[PDB]
Design a protein around this ligand. Structure first.
Ligand SMILES: CCCCCCCC/C=C/CCCCCCCC(=O)OC[C@H](COP(=O)(O)OCCN)OC(=O)CCCCCCC/C=C/CCCCCCCC
Ligand SMILES: CCCCCCCC/C=C/CCCCCCCC(=O)OC[C@H](COP(=O)(O)OCCN)OC(=O)CCCCCCC/C=C/CCCCCCCC
Ligand SMILES: CCCCCCCC/C=C/CCCCCCCC(=O)OC[C@H](COP(=O)(O)OCCN)OC(=O)CCCCCCC/C=C/CCCCCCCC
Ligand SMILES: CC(C)CCC[C@@H](C)[C@H]1CC[C@H]2[C@@H]3CC=C4C[C@@H](OC(=O)CCC(=O)O)CC[C@]4(C)[C@H]3CC[C@]12C
Ligand SMILES: C/C(=C\C[C@@]12O[C@]1(C)C(=O)c1ccccc1C2=O)CCC[C@H](C)CCC[C@H](C)CCCC(C)C
Ligand SMILES: *[C@@H]1O[C@H](CO)[C@@H](O[C@@H]2O[C@H](CO)[C@@H](O)[C@H](O)[C@H]2NC(C)=O)[C@H](O)[C@H]1NC(C)=O
Ligand SMILES: *[C@@H]1O[C@H](CO)[C@@H](O[C@@H]2O[C@H](CO)[C@@H](O)[C@H](O)[C@H]2NC(C)=O)[C@H](O)[C@H]1NC(C)=O
Ligand SMILES: CC(C)CCC[C@@H](C)[C@H]1CC[C@H]2[C@@H]3CC=C4C[C@@H](O)CC[C@]4(C)[C@H]3CC[C@]12C
Ligand SMILES: *[C@@H]1O[C@H](CO)[C@@H](O)[C@H](O)[C@H]1NC(C)=O
Lengths: 21, 673
């Protein structure tokens, strides 16, 4: 449950601040 | 003596070490210090189970788990779960003793040590208010805040209503003026002044009164950015001087009350709202009982005068010449000076620790730069190559981690790569070589790679005092494109989306368009790129202005050939999504017309969610208050029960698995729902 394939890994087309916990 | 009234001392007091030592140990009323100590202890007691993570310790530190951890030092390791519960219990007891004033010094140390151990345990939980809590505890350890309104005076008639030295207030006042000054001198960055950091914060309903005389963009530019910068820069000067104390008090109170509602930053707002009466006279609690009714003036302790103490040096014109200060007074003065100097210097120490400097300087947590830089992540890809057979595989991004902050820092990335290298052999993999490919856009800029994708991070070189070599520089000479980017984004339909990408020369981007992503195209804005279709092997060159349509369900590669960085954009439509919505709307309209003369289930559940939202809007605030109190009570009860279970296990021993299961199931009962 920790391996992908080339198809799902290469999908590119699918803001946060570090102070809020 | 106008300056003597303005500053509280004279120039002659700073002309010698002896005079300064005498001035810094001047007797002072201890009431304000006691009130601040009580409030700080109470707030820390309330904060320990919520933000520090006492109610998630079993999930975070579950025994026998494969997790990658990010400590400041790899020599620091966590203990088993029961010893974590013991450490948190000790910290809670220390905070309670600090609040009550009972055994002040021992309680201070008991709170101080485990807190900093837990703080240094994980680098991914550092922020500014946790750092402030640690600093405040460290300061309060060396003070004497149990000289008034404390249990320690009831069982000892030598620390009740006694004087305190002056530097006890000077240290705290100097600290609260570094927070506000070094926080508005970091908000003189072009992205805060121009109004790019917090652009959507003005949409809140709490800014509605300002909209009666200002436009939305003007409200965002003036009230949120410039007003905040001016308040941060001038709050300390307003609070210090008694001519303008009331206006400064009102302004900072309004500011912190607003910030408590806008964001979720724990107890930061309440802490800094109780640290502002430490700028008023040290006798304000004593004077505040003169306005309460005399009926309620008899249950409180009698307001006598402070009694002499050995901590502060005494210099009187008639009451003897004065005693030579001992080691205590000189140590206190030296501590004040050195601590203030170091606190001033530390936020600007980033030119020494060059290994922690990414796009943003230093590690986050100790530089007083809040809500200045915002990040957006587009794609993350982790690929390993087997060192024996050469097979290529892809890992799920963020597998053995409990955070997401490793994507921005090179040290955290190195730690994650080492953890993966150690953990992968357990899954039938030889020694791996791991590569990373992360696209980040900071403050509404072009998306670009932050790390080199051709470098094996396992064997890379990283040092704390050396600048990292595999970190891609931020393309600063593309910010003036943001107005055109915003215009292009605004000039769109309700179905299309746009992605802006800037690529370095010599690298290429490989993408796989999904089947549902029909009608996708690439348009070039600057530079020159070549697009290759993997299926039909052929290259096509592009120039500034033209666009090309790409197929669905196929691999395509984009190559950058210009000597300078080039930027393009993606325009794509979800054909399946639009078709689904249009048929759903048509069917709903037809059914409504017929009645009045799984897609349906999705529409009905969305309508049910909207109805629930509108009913929660219509209902008053008392149900929300009841629910909030119920949730808080549940979290407190859960933490208490798990702590008791672990303490019993530590003291006696593991009784049995069945009984353990029964008590664990009991501990999550959700009292009232
Ligand atoms: C020391 C406790 C400080 C508590 C921190 C609270 C806030 C202060 C902010 C500190 C910023 C960063 C500190 C930089 C120096 C300390 C770290 C250090 O030396 O060790 C790091 C590094 C390895 O770290 P890993 O966790 O493997 O790196 C992650 C990727 N693998 O260690 C080494 O290289 C071995 C030791 C070499 C340096 C040792 C120290 C030499 C002198 C520097 C003084 C250290 C600073 C102390 C700060 C005091 C005042 C703030
Ligand atoms: C107009 C000329 C000065 C311009 C600006 C003046 C100060 C600006 C705003 C300062 C806000 C608070 C930051 C500093 C807080 C610590 C000093 C402090 O609280 O002073 C008050 C206090 C007396 O005040 P009260 O009796 O409450 O009188 C009420 C005032 N109406 O005075 C003292 O603390 C005496 C100590 C002298 C300064 C020592 C503390 C700071 C030391 C600085 C360390 C850095 C080293 C370099 C400095 C060189 C100093 C030799
Ligand atoms: C004495 C033995 C028994 C003790 C208790 C008996 C049963 C009562 C059990 C209490 C369980 C729940 C109460 C504790 C919750 C306290 C409020 C709290 O922490 O609120 C959190 C909230 C932040 O929440 P977020 O999730 O960020 O909200 C998002 C908003 N944008 O923070 C605050 O509200 C801070 C306010 C500080 C506390 C308010 C003080 C007012 C009440 C004072 C208490 C007076 C008595 C205290 C104890 C008396 C002992 C003699
Ligand atoms: C028996 C089972 C069902 C446990 C359920 C009880 C809980 C509702 C208890 C367990 C821990 C208790 C808390 C433990 C510690 C404190 C600290 C205490 O802080 C103080 O100010 C008290 C000290 C003092 O003023 O003398 C206030 C009550 C509170 C929140 C208690 C409120 C009630 C809690 C959450
Ligand atoms: C600075 C800002 C956000 C960042 C940050 O505030 C945060 C989150 C914070 O935790 C903090 C703690 C202590 C010191 C500084 C900071 C901050 O940096 C947003 C300003 C907006 C503000 C909430 C309204 C300001 C309005 C003007 C002051 C106008 C006066 C009011 C009118 C009645 C005349
Ligand atoms: C593919 O998507 C593009 C982008 O939305 C469509 O181009 C738009 O076409 C409409 C005409 O119906 C124009 O009004 C818009 O101005 C066009 N957009 C842009 C950015 O020029 C295109 O029609 C779509 N093609 C198909 C077959 O659906
Ligand atoms: C498409 O053009 C590129 C030149 O940009 C050709 O050469 C490749 O260039 C990239 C980027 O420099 C290298 O990483 C590759 O190794 C080059 N060779 C190949 C085979 O990709 C590329 O050959 C052209 N494509 C075709 C099908 O001719
Ligand atoms: C049992 C052990 C792990 C507890 C940890 C204790 C040591 C490491 C803690 C206790 C007090 C801490 C110090 C408290 C205050 C400051 C000032 C700050 O500006 C830099 C960090 C610094 C200097 C801390 C460094 C870490 C420190 C020295
Ligand atoms: C939108 O496109 C994605 C692929 O990028 C697809 O998984 C998703 O199902 C689409 N939306 C709908 C509503 O089908």
């Amino acid at each position: 449950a920790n391996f992908l394939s080339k198809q799902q890994a290469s999908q590119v087309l699918v803001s946060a601040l570090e102070e809020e916990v | 003596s106008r300056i003597g009234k303005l500053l509280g001392f004279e120039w002659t007091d700073l002309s010698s070490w002896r005079r300064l030592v005498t001035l810094l140990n001047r007797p002072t009323d201890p009431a304000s210090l006691a009130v601040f100590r009580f409030l700080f202890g109470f707030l820390m007691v309330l904060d320990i189970p919520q933000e520090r993570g006492l109610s998630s310790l079993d999930r975070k530190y579950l025994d026998g788990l494969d997790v990658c951890r990010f400590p400041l030092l790899d020599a620091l390791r966590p203990l088993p779960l029961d010893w974590m519960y013991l450490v948190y219990t000790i910290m809670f007891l220390g905070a309670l003793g600090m609040m009550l004033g009972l055994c002040y010094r021992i309680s201070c140390v008991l709170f101080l040590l485990p807190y900093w151990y837990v703080f240094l345990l994980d680098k991914t939980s550092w922020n500014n208010h946790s750092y402030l809590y640690g600093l405040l505890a460290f300061q309060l350890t060396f003070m004497d805040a149990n000289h008034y309104w404390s249990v320690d005076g009831l069982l000892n008639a030598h620390r009740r209503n006694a004087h305190v030295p002056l530097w006890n207030y000077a240290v705290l006042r100097g600290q609260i003026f570094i927070v506000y000054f070094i926080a508005g001198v970091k908000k003189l960055d072009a992205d805060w002044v121009e109004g790019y950091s917090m652009e959507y914060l003005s949409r809140h309903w709490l800014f509605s009164p300002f909209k009666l005389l200002l436009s939305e963009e003007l409200t965002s530019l003036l009230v949120v950015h410039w007003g905040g910068l001016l308040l941060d820069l001038s709050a300390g000067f307003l609070l210090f001087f008694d001519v303008s104390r009331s206006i400064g008090l009102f302004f900072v109170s309004y500011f912190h009350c607003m910030n408590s509602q806008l964001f979720s930053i724990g107890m930061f707002s309440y802490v800094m709202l109780a640290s502002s009466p430490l700028f008023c006279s040290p006798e304000w609690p004593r004077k505040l009982v003169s306005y309460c009714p005399r009926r309620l003036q008899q249950l409180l302790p009698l307001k006598a005068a402070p009694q002499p103490s050995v901590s502060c040096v005494y210099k009187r014109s008639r009451g003897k010449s004065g005693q030579k200060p001992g080691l205590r007074h000189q140590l206190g003065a030296a501590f004040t000076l050195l601590y203030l100097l170091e606190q001033l210097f530390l936020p600007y120490s980033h030119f020494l620790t060059q290994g922690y400097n990414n796009w943003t300087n230093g590690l986050y947590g100790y530089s007083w730069d809040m809500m200045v830089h915002s990040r957006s992540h587009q794609h993350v890809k982790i690929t390993y190559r087997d060192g024996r057979t050469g097979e290529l595989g892809y890992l799920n991004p963020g597998v053995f981690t409990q955070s997401r902050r490793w994507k921005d820092h090179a040290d955290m990335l190195k730690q994650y790569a080492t953890c993966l290298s150690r953990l992968l052999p357990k899954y039938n993999v030889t020694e791996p070589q791991i590569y990373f490919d992360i696209w980040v856009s900071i403050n509404d800029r072009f998306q670009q790679r932050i790390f080199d994708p051709r470098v094996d991070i396992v064997q890379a070189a990283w040092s704390p005092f050396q600048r990292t070599s595999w970190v891609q520089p931020l393309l600063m000479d593309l910010s003036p494109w943001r107005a055109k980017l915003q215009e292009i984004k605004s000039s769109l339909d309700n179905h299309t989306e746009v992605v802006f990408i800037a690529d370095f020369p010599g690298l290429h981007l490989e993408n796989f368009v999904s089947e549902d992503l029909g009608n996708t195209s690439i348009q070039l804005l600057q530079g020159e790129v070549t697009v290759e279709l993997v299926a039909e092997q052929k290259n096509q060159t592009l120039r500034e202005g033209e666009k090309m349509q790409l197929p669905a369900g196929e691999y395509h590669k984009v190559y950058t050939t210009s000597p300078s960085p080039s930027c393009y954009m993606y325009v794509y439509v979800n054909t399946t999504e639009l078709a689904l919505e249009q048929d759903l709307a048509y069917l709903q309209e037809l059914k409504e017309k017929v009645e009045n003369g799984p897609l349906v289930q999705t529409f009905l559940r969305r309508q049910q969610r909207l109805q629930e939202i509108e009913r929660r809007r219509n209902t008053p605030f008392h149900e929300r208050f009841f629910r909030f109190l119920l949730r808080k009570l549940y979290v407190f009860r859960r933490s208490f029960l798990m702590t008791c279970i672990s303490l019993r296990n530590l003291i006696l021993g593991r009784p049995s698995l069945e009984q353990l299961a029964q008590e664990v199931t009991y501990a999550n009962l959700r009292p009232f729902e």
